[PDB]
Amino acid sequence: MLYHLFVNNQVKLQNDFKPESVAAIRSSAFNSKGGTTVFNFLSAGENILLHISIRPGENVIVFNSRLKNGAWGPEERIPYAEKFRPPNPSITVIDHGDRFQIRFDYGTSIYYNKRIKENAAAIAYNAENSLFSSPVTVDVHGLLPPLPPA
Amino acid sequence: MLYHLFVNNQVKLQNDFKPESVAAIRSSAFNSKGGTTVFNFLSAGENILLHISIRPGENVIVFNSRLKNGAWGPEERIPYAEKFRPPNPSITVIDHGDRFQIRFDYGTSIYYNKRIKENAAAIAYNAENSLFSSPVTVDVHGLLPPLPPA
Amino acid sequence: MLYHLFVNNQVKLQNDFKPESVAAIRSSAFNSKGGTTVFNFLSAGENILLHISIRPGENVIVFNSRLKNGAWGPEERIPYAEKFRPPNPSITVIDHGDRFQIRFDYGTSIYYNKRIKENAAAIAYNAENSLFSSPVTVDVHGLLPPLPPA
Amino acid sequence: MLYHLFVNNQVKLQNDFKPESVAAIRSSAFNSKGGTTVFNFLSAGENILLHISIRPGENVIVFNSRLKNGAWGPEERIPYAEKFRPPNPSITVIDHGDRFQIRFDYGTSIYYNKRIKENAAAIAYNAENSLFSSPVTVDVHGLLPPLPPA
Ligand SMILES: C[C@@H]1O[C@@H](O)[C@@H](O)[C@H](O)[C@@H]1O[C@@H]1O[C@H](CO)[C@H](O)[C@H](O)[C@H]1O
Ligand SMILES: [Mg+2]
């Protein structure tokens, strides 16, 4: 399923993002002057199941979760440098049941253990000055699609 | 290469669209009450190499070409009904050297013999009330990619 | 649909290979000392709709057709060199209605106008000392599959 | 990289199967009357890193590991029923660093925590009466490839 996810907006998913689901987010641009750029996977109750905060200014990408009216938990941090490939950078998120896998354009996959036991009903995209295009292209799968060779 | 092509706008291609090239256009929506929706492949000199006029009202899709300041040639027409698959309809255009292949979601491909011997430098998208999303997602390849098994 | 096509053997297709169909043939090896290696697309009546004779020693690839009991027609020839990429070379055949498209690993596509107006029911593979593996992997599609971004 | 893995045989990988690697195993057949069918991922020292024993008669798929000259460890079991899709069933194995993901045609993936900390140098296939074709097609990637749309 193809969605166009606009900056400072969200897309309501046709079906729950749940174990086996794959979200392939692709940008048509890389804005080198972009600031903190965020993607959130939200439950129907607006709990933030997976928060991805890309922060060029701190050279970090931060992962976290929080309940709608609750506090942020411990942060899981990785370096920002050499993760994205211009001019079409990407983020791929896969739900593995007990954890999410997050893949950027370079480096090994990041794994983030689930903290809130709910499926996602929406994906949100926030930035005052995005690193990426508005919208981003998002293809969401219920399961890994058949793979091309080589 | 990924482009976001907005309605009543165009995208300037990073490289010439030429023999072997593939453009996969995908919409995030289908607006069944939409009106005439147009895609043009344009040369650097703004000649319309391939014009695709999708007309729900006349129940036809019209293919044509014209020079920048010239007249339209003879029309090539096919039925509009049962060509598109909501909610993510698509148009795939392939340059076969002597002719373009155009494939929608249903039916056999349309083949359109080239009339203007130039490569395309841009793709334009026009509609007052589009059948499709704005933008559409466009992936352009210099050659057919490795294919998944399904 | 996946088939394993062995040397000096054939595969009977589950469905007719007809307009829009795609056959992606892939080898697990390349024996550069191999001899003439042939693929045939056969109708139910055993007419050879498309014959591909790959001849390293003559430095040509020859395309032709013939009826079951018939003489070969005129040959359509291209050079052999600079077509195949080791160690997993490929041949992709697409039925465009009035002609076949044949793509190797390098170079522009070859187009071969249809001579016998029948669909293919089988694909055969013959060689005394094949350039390719036994079997080759063959994925056959009724229409071009959705394409990866790269 | 494409391999043809024959029954009661193995393939030596051109590169180590290691974190981020993907092996897509595809059969050209499903033999309904077939018996216990095994795939092993082996290290260069012939330790069995991942053993997959598919047992139609017992309605189970058993996962385990053992050193070359060592005994099996504790088993991890899942149901066999409705995991495979005729006529081209598949198994996809992905190395996630601390664990393997194993995905069949239906149901949720199986995750198997690594027991022996070595990369795999070969994949073996064993059966007296295989559920699957001989060979099976195996495409091995160093990283997840770009994904086609749904
Ligand atoms: C019969 C011809 O023999 C020699 O003249 C070759 O140089 C020609 O190409 C012909 O060879 C035959 O060609 C047909 C296709 O036209 C088949 O490939 C046949 O197997 C081959 O012997
Ligand atoms: Mg009009």
Author numbering:
A (entry chain D), B (entry chain C), C (entry chain A), D (entry chain B): 1 to 150
Sentences from the paper on this structure:
Galectins are β-galactoside-binding lectins known primarily from animals and fungi. The fungus C. cinerea expresses several fruiting body lectins including two isogalectins, CGL1 and CGL2, and a galectin-related lectin, CGL3. In agreement with this hypothesis, we demonstrate that the C. cinerea galectin CGL2 exhibited a pronounced toxicity towards the model nematode C. elegans. Based on a number of approaches, including the use of E. coli expressing these fungal lectins to mimic the in vivo situation, we conclude that this nematotoxicity is dependent on the specific interaction between these proteins and a β-galactoside on the core of N-glycans in the C. elegans intestine.
Based on these results, the specificity of CGL2 for β-galactosides and the reported capping of core α1,6-fucose on C. elegans N-glycans with galactose residues in β1,4-configuration, we hypothesized that binding of CGL2 to this Galβ1,4Fucα1,6 epitope was required for its nematotoxicity. In order to provide biochemical and structural evidence for the interaction between CGL2 and this nematode-specific β-galactoside, the trisaccharide Galβ1,4Fucα1,6GlcNAc was chemically synthesized with a linker at the reducing end and used as ligand in in vitro binding experiments with affinity-purified CGL2. Isothermal titration microcalorimetry measurements confirmed binding of this trisaccharide to CGL2 and suggested a dissociation constant of approximately 100 µM. The molecular basis of this interaction was investigated by determining the X-ray structure of cocrystals between CGL2 and the trisaccharide at 1.5 Å resolution. A major difference between these structures lies in the orientation of the preceding monosaccharide subunits to the protein, e.g. the plane of Glc in lactose is perpendicular to the plane of Fuc in the trisaccharide. Due to the low number of direct contacts, there seems to exist a high degree of flexibility on the side of CGL2 with regard to the identity of this monosaccharide subunit. The only constraint is the orientation of the 3′ (in glucose and fucose) or 4′ (in GalNAc) OH of the linked monosaccharide to allow interaction with the conserved carbohydrate-coordinating residues, Arg55 and Glu75. In addition, these hydroxyl groups make additional contact to Arg77 in case of Glc (in lactose) and Fuc (in Galβ1,4Fucα1,6GlcNAc) but not in case of GalNAc (in Thomsen-Friedenreich antigen). In an in vivo context, the CGL2 epitope is part of a larger N-glycan structure, which may indeed have a higher affinity towards the lectin than the trisaccharide tested here.
